[PDB]
């Protein structure tokens, strides 16, 4: 768990060197993008349940997975699916605020593949659900904030696949 | 079911089944024939139950079928009839099993979270199960209507 600042400090410390001009430039880049990160995080905190339910309405609804035999069939499985998608959106917001995806592979992508493979959860359908969540939130917060959200959404989909 | 519940309740207590629980399982085993008769009554006439209950529901709560209602546009009413069919199927499962752990353990745990994520009024769903209960207990004898209305009662109680 480290943001862009802590990773820059960790690189300069593992070097043992002081903060040179490249580290200063990286921190200036983060300190310019931080206000946009803050406003996108507020806008995403506004519409958590709406983004999640629009992602299910785009991908998972009216397909086979909500029908009998699907892994999203029962009300318990539906509630756990909404819970999993809320987790993905919340941690993508955290990784957007930090500017570093270390929290994603520390706390989402750690044992997620083995959990989903033990439960029988389809990984492709949940990857499509995360992609639709990314599409909806990029329609919500704009072009560049949607892109800096979608880089961590693509990180979650890549670590899941 | 009854046997699962008795086994688990003796299982946490690190004891065998008490004889009172054993005659409970025995009485449920004897009443299984009437349970199967109620299940055939509920299974064979599901078309009229779902149709008449949907009709009485949309008569009672017209706003969900009205513009701006969650169930709007033929498929929204029709889609709702599928959810009502799901709940009648779980009613049949709970009638056979002798307990509400099929109904609760399948379609009542996260029902509030699911129907809040869909944008559905849960009171109108409780009215749908109420009309299903009215049509179903209008279809049977007295003790059969009471035994089926117990599980219908549990579903409407677990809604609100």
């Amino acid at each position: 768990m480290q943001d862009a600042i802590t990773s820059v400090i960790n690189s300069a410390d593992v070097q043992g060197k002081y903060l040179d001009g490249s580290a200063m430039d990286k921190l200036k880049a983060y300190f310019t993008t931080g206000a946009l990160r803050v406003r996108a995080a507020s806008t995403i905190s506004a519409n958590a349940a709406a983004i999640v339910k629009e992602a299910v309405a785009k991908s998972l609804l009216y397909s086979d997975v909500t029908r009998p035999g699907g892994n999203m069939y029962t009300t318990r499985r539906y509630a756990a699916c909404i819970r999993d998608l809320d987790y993905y959106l919340r941690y993508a917001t955290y990784a957007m605020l930090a500017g570093d995806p270390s929290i994603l592979d520390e706390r989402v992508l750690n044992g997620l593949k083995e959990t989903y493979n033990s439960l029988g959860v389809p990984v492709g359908s949940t990857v499509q659900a995360i992609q639709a969540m990314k599409e909806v939130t990029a329609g919500l917060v704009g072009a560049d904030a949607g892109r800096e959200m979608g880089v961590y959404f693509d990180y979650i989909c890549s670590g899941l696949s | 079911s009854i046997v699962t519940k008795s086994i688990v309740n003796a299982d946490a207590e690190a004891r065998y089944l008490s004889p009172g629980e054993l005659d409970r399982i025995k009485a449920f085993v004897t009443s299984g024939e009437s349970r199967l008769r109620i299940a055939e009554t509920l299974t064979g006439s599901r078309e009229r139950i779902i149709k008449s209950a949907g009709d009485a529901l949309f008569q009672k709560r017209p706003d969900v079928v009205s513009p701006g209602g969650n169930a709007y546009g033929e498929e929204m009413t029709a889609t709702c009839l599928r959810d009502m069919d799901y709940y009648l199927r779980l009613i049949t499962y709970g009638v056979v099993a002798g307990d509400v752990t099929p109904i609760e353990e399948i379609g009542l745990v996260g029902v509030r979270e699911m129907y809040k994520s869909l944008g559905t009024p849960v009171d109108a769903v409780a009215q749908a199960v109420r009309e299903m209960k009215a049509v179903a207990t209008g279809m049977m004898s007295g003790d059969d209507a009471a035994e089926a209305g117990a599980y219908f009662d549990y579903v409407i109680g677990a809604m609100e």
Partner: peptide, 27 residues
């Protein structure tokens, strides 16, 4: 003919599209 896609079958159990006729029939 060897269709490369899923067969033309429809109205699987627990589908809302099967209950769309009965949705039309009710008020």
């Amino acid at each position: 003919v060897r269709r490369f896609r899923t067969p033309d079958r429809v109205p699987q159990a627990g589908d809302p599209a099967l209950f769309l006729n009965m949705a039309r029939s009710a008020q």
